[PDB]
From a paper:
In all cases, trehalose 6-phosphate is dephosphorylated by OtsB (EC 3.1.3.12, trehalose-6-phosphate phosphohydrolase) to give trehalose.
To establish the structural basis for the donor specificity of S. venezuelae OtsA, the recombinant enzyme was crystallized. Crystals diffracted to 1.95 Å, allowing the protein structure to be solved using molecular replacement. Four copies of the S. venezuelae OtsA protein were present in the asymmetric unit. Consistent with the size observed in solution, the biological unit appeared to be a dimer. The fold comprised twin Rossman-like β/α/β domains in a GT-B configuration. A molecule of MES buffer is bound in a cleft between the two domains of S. venezuelae OtsA in what is likely to be the active site, by analogy with the E. coli enzyme. By contrast, the equivalent residues that define the donor base specificity of VldE, which uses GDP-valienol, are similar in S. venezuelae OtsA. Our structure of S. venezuelae OtsA most closely resembles the open conformations despite not having any ligands bound.
Numbering used by the authors:
A (entry chain A), B (entry chain C): 1 to 17, 23 to 451
The structure:
Amino acid sequence: GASVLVASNRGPVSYVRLDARRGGGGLVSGLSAVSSQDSLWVCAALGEGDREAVRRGIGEPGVRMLDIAPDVYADAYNGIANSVLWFLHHHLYDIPREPVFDAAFRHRWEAYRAYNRAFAEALAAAADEGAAVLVQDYHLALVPGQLRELRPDLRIGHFTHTPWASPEYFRMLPADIGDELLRGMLGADELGFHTSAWASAFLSCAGGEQPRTRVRVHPLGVDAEELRALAHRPQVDERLARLREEVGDRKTIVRVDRTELSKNILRGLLAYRELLTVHPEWRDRVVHLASAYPSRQDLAAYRAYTASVTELAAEINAEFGTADWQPVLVSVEDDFTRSLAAYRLADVALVNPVRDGMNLVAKEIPVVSDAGCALVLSTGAGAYEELKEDALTVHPYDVSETAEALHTALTMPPPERADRTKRLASAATALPPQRWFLNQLEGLSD
Amino acid sequence: GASVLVASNRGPVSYVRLDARRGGGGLVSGLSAVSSQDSLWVCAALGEGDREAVRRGIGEPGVRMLDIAPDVYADAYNGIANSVLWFLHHHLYDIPREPVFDAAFRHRWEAYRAYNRAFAEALAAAADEGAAVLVQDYHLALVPGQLRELRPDLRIGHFTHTPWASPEYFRMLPADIGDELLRGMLGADELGFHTSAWASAFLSCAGGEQPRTRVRVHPLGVDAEELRALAHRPQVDERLARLREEVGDRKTIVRVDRTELSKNILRGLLAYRELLTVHPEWRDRVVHLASAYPSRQDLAAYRAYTASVTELAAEINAEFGTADWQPVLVSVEDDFTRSLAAYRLADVALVNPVRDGMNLVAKEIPVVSDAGCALVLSTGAGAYEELKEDALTVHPYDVSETAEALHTALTMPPPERADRTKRLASAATALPPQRWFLNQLEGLSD
């Protein structure tokens, strides 16, 4: 019997041939405020090692891991969730070719239903009378509706971490699919989003007027003390020292995002090319740090995006580079110690996604900046509504405006830059992970 | 000094090495409906022949061809009009990569302004006091505002033959560009679109309180007599005989569209493949006629689409074909004689674009059908609002729904198909080209 339950595809522990491997994060932090004698976290076995753990009865106290059939899991999680819903909500489809709702899609939708149902049955079995249930993200959007039918006594929350598709865009789904998805989520007493634009979009898709479901905005932020302590370890100090050597005495424009289609890395690079073309005074005087670390390697479009990032970076280096200067410093590692050092050094942060739910990098950088950092932020970034007073606004498709914002950011008077950096840090730490989580739990008392 | 003026990129005369030749067709028929002594049609020179005619001072009466500098023409017409605005209004952008509004875009936009201004200045010099000016299509969307400034007395109409972008999609343009485009259009006393959805989208983008612009819906139809006469020439009878032998004793699903990105040929082929998989009784009993004739060869995306259409048709032939049956008959030529024959033969017509202004094919087939034709029509087709009661409706992304409509179409009992065809033919001809255009001229009374 649990009185507080969480459901997410990914739980706190992963097992490998068995050894246990812990990932932290927002949910670990949030549940650490809840009595561990009263909570249960339901999650999925992510691969063979996790399924073996479940097979042997090996598992963490307060965690229930579900063995969902590998082909049903692939079709639900990689198929519908991470391809079809991810693309829908981020507006990423190449309209002449995708989406395609065919017989195979329908088969994969049936698995998505069955994947969600395994979670709903687990929660239904474990939850005390009137328990609070917090369902996390688009993977489990049918759970609230399924679980409402099994257990009308439960208090059910669901939080979407992505954007929500605009109503016109959402109507690409066949009507029966769209409608099943909306009913799935409308089973909740409370639906949460990071921003009111995402919340409004969901509300418009539902037709307005959904009186049993409270729609709310809980924008996730950062724990200042925790991030600062990590950023000031000697390993970061060391790596920062090496990074200053690599950059030289030059200014920095920093990003660290993986090559995900919504991140808008290419147009960012194009804006950098135009900056160096139009404002030649920056040649030998600035370096753009960017990542070409792959987001995904199992879709053709994602592999082509990563390759285009690599190639465009190399074109810019060949055009403007000298023996002493590399204009784009490309990282292909995923090393958080290096990112923290990049955050500490940054003169300019380039956070220009087409659309996103909440990129925390916009919040993380100002919190750890050693001497101030100007933020170039797109209107589609989830952090936009909270940070727009002290960031330089850019419209994500507008490369010329993005190039000009880089110039304004690079020339921002140092005391203005500090005042902005301090106000950005304040807004960024308003709702750390633990209070973000507790507000959702509190919302289920409403 | 003329009292009725028409403006379009393409005029009614083409010069070939010199001989004036008049290609005609439905829309040129319409725009010519007010050729008189007191009228003028301003258009651009399109080949070296046209350019020679202008340089020499050779022209047909009532026609003024403009020699626009070749680089301004390329950037304005191929670039901004046929690439930027075409993609915008049909929603064809691949969001992770395009659109990109950079320095080169800005330079092409300046050419688009100058190209529109060449037309505006010609019209200004040639129009009598309070003359009616009918400007045609998205190429010339700035002319009304430009001309309005030069000549406040003129009565100006503008007709858009494409869709209009939804307000959210239209806001991808930089705000100064979007606002200039809208002010360009709003110079007019009347703005015309083929459908209410398109007019409504423009009205929503324009917002505001524009008291001197009325927005009207004039859907272009077909002249039955001109079309039937062309469809029953001996050359069509002869090509139709051959086509029956190519097909054999089998049903036909017909389309003739070039490989343009909005046409949705790939999803149509996937629906055909699904039809033959789910209703396999149709093997050896139907042939799908489709075209792989190129729409364009100067954009990478258009070359890729043509290659995909070719490849997919070949996969379907390899998958289901036998010595005596080839399921997809691919045409790689552009012969209107063959197309009229296929119109007359068609059991099913497949008109499933993602979005279009008015494709007349949906109207032409029922007009000339020898024995009845079942029309499968997408909700995004321009003809949808007029033809939906007797067409089988499909949603353009729903390949299963499109495959099921193909089955319903092929199994339709002949007398139901006949009644539907007659009603379609009636709807198709309610507003033929000459009246369509005369109503616009009458619209400029007041």
